[PDB]
């Protein structure tokens, strides 16, 4: 009987197939001839965009050890070409067919296919991805439409991409909204560029959940009164977060849009704009669009007449060309029968770590957990190690399964509390999830084993990417020592991130929120760095039109739109004048002082005013008081 059958081969399955091949475990892959969304986008010439996630978090460790030389955002073409390279390596292991049904029994499953052939396997892994309505819409979009109005009832990374393609042709965008969370995908730290995933230092949650909450949440929840942040200039961007009940922040179930702020876009791309646009680097700065009025936010109950295609706002009956509403993704699962009889109903909270459904036996799910920030690779690489160990080590399979229902209950109590289930439950902070899996497998690090300040920087501030856990032990990858060294040298050993936590250790949440927004450029949604890029935006629109071979008449003044913008931006016009120029920027000065201190004691042993108080905090990091995670235990 077949030891392992993997159903679906795209991107998520690659690291699991690698480990099964290494241990020479018997496996077979079954994957559809139709392919993936990337295949159909490639065939229609629509891989003309870029990822919302950094290279280090979006490609697997065994590629990074060869190819990493700098932080950057890959293109969609680069991502798909990597899928195809690995498909070519493993194609001899792939049967091209479509699984229609799985009958699950006590220790094996019977797999049915559209061709009529059946397969038996002890262990079955599903890696089939999601269906998304927005995908078809992206695949049929005519990007030459010009001088029209669009109404959106949803906002998300796919809607933000469509908006980026519409803005250059003088199209006007109305968002009927109940709020959204958007975050600059690259920020400045003392002028230097960092991708947002580098700033999260997740293991500081072990110091205390309250400290970590202060470190992370002021850009998401409306905690600062600073008139420069977008959620004070445009209050309709604020979401209702009354559902949150967990003390673990950012909460499981929070989602965010990641976008290019125009200042960092200028820094990277101004010298070769037409080529960068043609490669897929599109300016998608939703904060710049709100600043300029090219997008307006209106209340969710603003009335729409769908027969006449009008929306009524500011006393104006505004005609619109197209209405856009996204849909809920759903996992692409075949029929699955419990004990060969009872249809299985998929529920994220009823699985362990999104991988092990407790209602089935020896069936595992790979690729159905989504990261809050960064790429899917971090998640699926760790899931693959977890699945590989469950399949190949019976003692580990038993250790996890013997108390599986108790582990799931404990996980849900920790991360969701009494909150009712939500459709976005499957989204997790990536550096909590990777560390959780590492502790379950046993490839984690121990804070008490740090000897020097440099060791503490690696433990707490070096990002919890999957490759962090593949230097030593069971799942070691050749070349990770050099990769970690290069990343450390290019980021000053993450001292600047380490010092953030040091700086807010004694603040309450209001003080920490004010401190976060006291920088000359704070990380997220800083509306002081938009007006100065108006001339560049004109240059960008011209470049975009040249690449798409479009001529756009922008001579006609749309006074009606200008009136609607004025109504929509009343709060901005009252709040923005309160922005004050400052002589000193507390956060910039505090971080600069902290970096100098840390780099000066980098190689000091831990056992050997501000400096004294900082050294005391550092010594306490060897014995963090909030390390317990009850769902890791075997009891
Ligand atoms: C527009 C878009 C942009 C994205 N951008 C990013 C980004 O910037 N960063 C990031 O990290 N992720 C991004 N993703 C998410 C993610 O990386 C992709 O969704 C990725 O394709 C998921 O890989 P997968 O292997 O899980 O699924 P897929 O790539 O969809 O592969 C699954 C395969 O299984 C096959 N299959 C399905 N059902 C069956 C069956 N019953 N029998 C046999 N075969 C079957 C399918 O035909 C397919 O070939 C994006 C996704 C989309 C749609
Ligand atoms: Cl990177």
Residue numbers in the entry: 1 to 608, 629 to 655
Sentences from the paper on this structure:
The flavin-dependent halogenase (FDH) AetF successively brominates tryptophan at C5 and C7 to generate 5,7-dibromotryptophan. In contrast to the well studied two-component tryptophan halogenases, AetF is a single-component flavoprotein monooxygenase. A large domain tightly binds the cofactor flavin adenine dinucleotide (FAD), while the small domain responsible for binding the nicotinamide adenine dinucleotide (NADP) is unoccupied. About half of the protein forms additional structural elements containing the tryptophan binding site.
Structure determination was straightforward for non-substrate-bound (empty AetF) and 5-Br-Trp-bound AetF (AetF–5-Br-Trp). These crystals were isomorphous to each other and scaled in space groups P41 or P43 without signs of twinning or translational noncrystallographic symmetry (tNCS). Empty AetF was solved in space group P43 by molecular replacement with two molecules per asymmetric unit. AetF retained a tightly bound FAD during purification and FAD is clearly visible in all chains. Our AetF structure shows a large empty space where NADP is bound in ZvPNO and AncFMO2.
